[PDB]
Design a protein around this nucleic acid. Structure first.
Lengths: 212, 116, 61, 121, 46, 37
RNA sequence: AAGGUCACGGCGAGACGAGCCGUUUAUCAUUACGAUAGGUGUCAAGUGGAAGUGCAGUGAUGUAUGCAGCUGAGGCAUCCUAACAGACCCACAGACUUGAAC
RNA sequence: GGCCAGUGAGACGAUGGGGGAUAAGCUUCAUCGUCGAGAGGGAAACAGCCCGGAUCACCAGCUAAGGCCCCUAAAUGACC
RNA sequence: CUAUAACGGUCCUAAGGUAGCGAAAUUCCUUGUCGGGUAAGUUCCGACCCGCACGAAAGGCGUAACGAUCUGGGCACUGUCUCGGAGAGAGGCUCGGUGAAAUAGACAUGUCUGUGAAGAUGCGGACUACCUGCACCUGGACAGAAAGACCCUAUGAAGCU
RNA sequence: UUCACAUCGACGGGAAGGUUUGGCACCUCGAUGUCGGCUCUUCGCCACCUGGGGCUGUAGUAUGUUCCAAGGGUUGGGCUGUUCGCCCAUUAAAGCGGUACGUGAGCUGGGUUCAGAACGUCGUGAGACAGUUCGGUCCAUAUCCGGUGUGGGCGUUAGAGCAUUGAGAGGACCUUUCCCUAGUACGAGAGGACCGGGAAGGACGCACCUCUGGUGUACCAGUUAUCGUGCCCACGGUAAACGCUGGGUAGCCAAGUGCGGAGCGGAUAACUGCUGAAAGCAUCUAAGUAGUAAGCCCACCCCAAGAUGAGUGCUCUCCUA
């Protein structure tokens, strides 16, 4: 349950905003490819919960299959790629018919949370996944960087599940929390936000207000 | 991880890879059409586009860098007398990567380089 | 996890935990585990074979 | 970055020359001592006409460092040596004339080091 | 490292048939390439 | 508190009360406030 | 059939499978989509003054051309090259039984 | 008596004791029961505890030890 | 004055340790006590001598030079370390060829807990697990080796005294 | 100072645990590899700290002892092979143990002190010491279970593309100074609060490369030796997998940069209670009920219907003979 509808935007590099007091803050720059049109609302009557379903990245019709574009043309909106809802408490007033919601709702709310696919690092070891220590690099040692002991002795007879092994590190989404908003641009369709979003410039990014 | 490392390294070390690039683009400029593997094909594509457009502006500095890159002496001087008369107005894209059957003994994906 | 915590949280796991240890837990009690239909509400959504009420032989309930 | 086996030069004329600093106080990291962190120094060598001799545990203040110093104004200050001031726990040193320049953020806790300094940048 | 016992006919016919089914998957690709190698304007196979 | 598991009621006003299963001893002096066995 | 898979051009994804983004009269015009990768043309950017010539110097060398010359893993533009040619899987109201109204 | 073998490492349980620390599934003896060499049933499983001594068949019945809510056969049996 | 023994008597031997050394490659107590070095020193050096159990060719005490000798400390120096990080090769991963080995009763080869020749995937109760691969890691299978070098038995074997 | 029970408790007694040394010799010697360290767990509470409370010979600060509570933490070093232990600087505190040294099919030293040698002592001697010192090979491609990731098949009762609910499971829920209140309560002074806020830290975690850098064998720049490009210039090769250096874009990384640890949310453990009876007095309880713990659950971030109980919602397609 979220405390309100959010938007989604793409990361476009990082820079530094110079505050007129004299400080230098590192900000991430957020663009918006297409407006976050509310496509499908799911209320308490026809569904077990209440959520507002928006989308993103208007595309060519060849890029989008028949169930997708049939679902989007059921709402009478543009064919678009990305599609996510926000679960919201039952006080909502949202029509699914082409609500091109403008981005003014976050500037006075100087706290926002963001979610995104972090950059994947592939099958990485235990020295960087779970912040282990390496063995002795010298003094006749042989267990350089290795995983060390894995379990206890005879009495378990196995290893505990969830034990810290090497595996695929990045690729899942994360949410970093309470990130204070900064100078929006009402003509450059760009929002400064002081922090570090998950991922390189180009990826999708959930931008939804806080849950404290 | 290889995020954004856009060098195309082969199954050979660095200086041997440089010699493979120079020799194979040299004999590519000698015969025109050539049989490579596909990694060697794209690795020829970047450098031989650099060597067609290098002696496109036939000065002395371009001719000396171009003679420094290519092995054979008499093929650089057969190049700038040929590339403005042929590959003017093309503005990039000097090759073609026509693929063929894999190689007997390796199942190596084998390609074939033109000049067009 | 205590009894009042399930009965506040998910009550239809109470009886479902009581009768699952009453049936022979092999391949066949697992098949007749699905015959149990426990619902927390006052009304069940079944109109299958006009379900007649269950006959009791227990004088101490 | 001041490890617990570094050599810091002296920034005053208290009576020492350099010091092996030992195991910082305050910031419990103790493998990264930035500016303003007091250190439990021991005297590696000293001036032999002063009541500060060899092998004497003392408390000092890291005032210069080869590691950088992130400021909010955008500047980054760094030195070429490491320096400490032989300090007492009640503020002021027991050496008056401070050698070398210091920064100005440590004025908010160590004002006597700034007031006795030749340059405050 | 040293195997404690041996495998059955069961598990071996499973693993060998996964190996040969992995050989099955790389010939409908060869049927597609052999079918595109036939009469048609394709800019490959000089 | 005193977990003296077996001492008798010792002041002249050590009333003896079983609350919540356990046996405790109360008195006017807070020295004698005990939870027995 | 809808939808996938192979192939194809790759990736900020990745041991292999995966995943993701393309797969071309690859806009036309009044205002967000039909540039995937390479090359090319420019712009950030790195090293930092290239060759050749002239001048000064006996010569090492310095100086003007000239923030020039190379690099261009990054941004934008550009269809010049390769996205051609295909192939294959999945089809044909989704068993049996009760209740409700039509 | 004739011919002719094994065995001579025992184990636990009750009683009578010694060694121990009246400690050990400990050690050594004396009488006995079981296992050894004993299947079946009860003991959740489980050599020595209880019933019990397996020639074999039956899609026969009555019982010992022990049990009669369900898993799992028989009482959600009766009265204090 | 507290001591300690220059000195004395007695017993037994063949004689009762001389110079020098001395918590030592020798000291059990012991990390003896003091001093140096160190912020801190069971290691080191310099001393005292209470030498379990030094000692004069099984030589004793010294020392220049020497040592892939042992050991204590210091300067310079650095990933040894704090505390890791990046890059290049040969492997590892994939494809095509060739293609073993140790091991192996058959394996339809879960976890807890209990029992049992007293440390169970195999027995009991419960819980958890769709089948089957690939890449890593090695906790268990009392994993592989190899009829335990240690301990004991053999009216064994052998060397040596 | 009076005073057994604020705190110790003599003379004695009763238990629990299996972490020391022991006793038995029950599994294992056709092989169960001891002690210490590194790496990496997980668990117990007999609690060192953090959270709540009682009592105090508790005026306040700080305590002494004890109850609930194991979520989290429990430093860096000199000596020694060391466990233990001593010492230094501290810290909120520097807990004790189980998991066959927990962990040598993950890794290395003293040792079951192996083979050489030396000192003391014992022995006539060969040799020996639960005495000392120097040197002294440690193997390995995972079959299965187990684990971490990642698929493919089939199922989910037509076949799909998305979108999510969340059963269940993980991670995070940690902690310290400084300031206001306030030099206020308290105390003759000296000292110096509880409670409620703020700010700066520490470890841990999730991210990122805008700045500062490390690397960067894409790169460019200086230079040595030499061989080629006919020769001068200028370049190319080699000096392993950069000849040695000087810097660096994009990646990766931290030492750098942001963020997190929230809840007059629910029920409780110890405790304080409110009415309040069994004994017309009483008592936290026997009926009902209130405050309240870093503990439990939920909320928090992610995965998640193979949750076979296989969910819910929207949309596309089943044609010809």
């Amino acid at each position: 349950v979220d405390a309100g509808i959010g938007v989604m935007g793409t990361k476009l590099g990082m820079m530094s905003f110079f505050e007129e007091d004299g400080t230098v803050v590192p900000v991430t720059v957020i663009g918006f490819k297409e407006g976050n049109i509310v496509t499908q609302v799911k209320t308490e009557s026809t569904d077990g919960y209440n959520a507002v379903q928006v989308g993103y990245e208007r595309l060519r019709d060849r890029k989008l299959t028949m169930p997708e574009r049939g679902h989007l043309n059921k709402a009478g909106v543009i064919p678009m790629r990305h599609l996510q809802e926000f679960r919201l408490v039952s006080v909502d007033d949202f029509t699914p018919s082409q609500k091109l919601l403008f981005e003014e709702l976050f500037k006075e709310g100087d706290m926002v949370d963001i979610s995104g696919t972090t950059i994947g690092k592939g099958f990485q070891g235990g020295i960087k996944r779970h912040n282990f220590k390496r063995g002795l690099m010298t003094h006749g040692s042989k267990s350089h960087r290795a995983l060390g002991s894995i379990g206890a002795g005879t009495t378990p007879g196995h290893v505990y599940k969830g034990k810290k092994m090497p595996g695929r590190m990045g690729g899942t989404k994360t949410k970093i929390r309470k990130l204070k908003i900064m100078k929006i641009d009402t003509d450059l369709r760009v929002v400064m936000i002081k922090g570090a979003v998950p991922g390189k410039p180009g990826n999708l990014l959930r931008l939804a207000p806080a849950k404290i | 991880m290889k995020h954004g490392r856009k060098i195309h390294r082969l199954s050979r070390p660095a200086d041997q890879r440089r010699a493979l690039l120079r020799g194979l683009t040299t004999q590519l400029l000698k015969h025109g059409r050539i049989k490579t593997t596909r990694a060697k094909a794209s690795a020829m594509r970047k450098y031989v586009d650099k060597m067609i457009t290098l002696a496109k502006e036939g000065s002395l500095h371009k001719r000396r860098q171009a003679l420094g890159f290519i092995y054979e002496k008499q093929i650089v001087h057969a190049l700038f007398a040929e590339v403005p008369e042929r590959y003017g107005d093309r503005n990039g894209g000097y090759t073609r990567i026509i693929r063929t059957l894999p190689r007997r003994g390796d199942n190596a994906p084998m390609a074939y380089i033109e000049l067009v | 996890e205590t009894f009042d915590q399930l009965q506040k949280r998910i009550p239809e796991r109470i009886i479902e935990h009581a009768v699952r240890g009453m049936l022979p837990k092999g391949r066949l009690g697992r098949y007749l585990f699905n015959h149990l239909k426990v619902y927390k509400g006052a009304e069940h959504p079944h109109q299958a074979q006009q379900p007649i009420d269950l006959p009791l032989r227990d004088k101490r309930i | 970055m001041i490890q617990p086996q570094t050599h810091l030069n002296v920034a005053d004329n208290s009576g020492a020359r350099e010091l092996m600093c030992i195991r910082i106080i305050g910031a419990s990291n103790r493998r990264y001592a930035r500016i303003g962190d007091v250190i439990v120094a021991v005297i590696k060598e000293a001036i032999p006409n002063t009541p500060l001799e060899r092998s004497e545990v003392i408390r000092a203040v890291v005032v210069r460092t080869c590691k950088e110093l992130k400021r909010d104004n955008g500047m980054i200050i760094r030195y070429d040596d490491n320096a400490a001031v032989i300090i007492d726990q009640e503020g002021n040193p027991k050496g008056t004339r401070i050698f070398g320049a210091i920064a100005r953020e440590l004025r908010q806790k160590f004002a006597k080091i700034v007031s006795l300094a030749p340059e405050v940048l | 490292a040293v195997p404690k016992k041996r495998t059955s006919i069961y598990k071996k016919r499973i693993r060998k048939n996964i190996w040969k089914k992995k050989g099955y998957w790389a010939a409908l690709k060869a049927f597609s390439l052999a079918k595109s190698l036939s009469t048609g304007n394709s800019k490959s196979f000089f | 508190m005193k977990i003296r598991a077996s001492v008798r009621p010792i002041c002249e006003k050590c009333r003896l009360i079983r609350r919540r299963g356990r046996i405790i001893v109360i008195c006017s002096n807070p020295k004698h406030k005990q939870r027995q066995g």
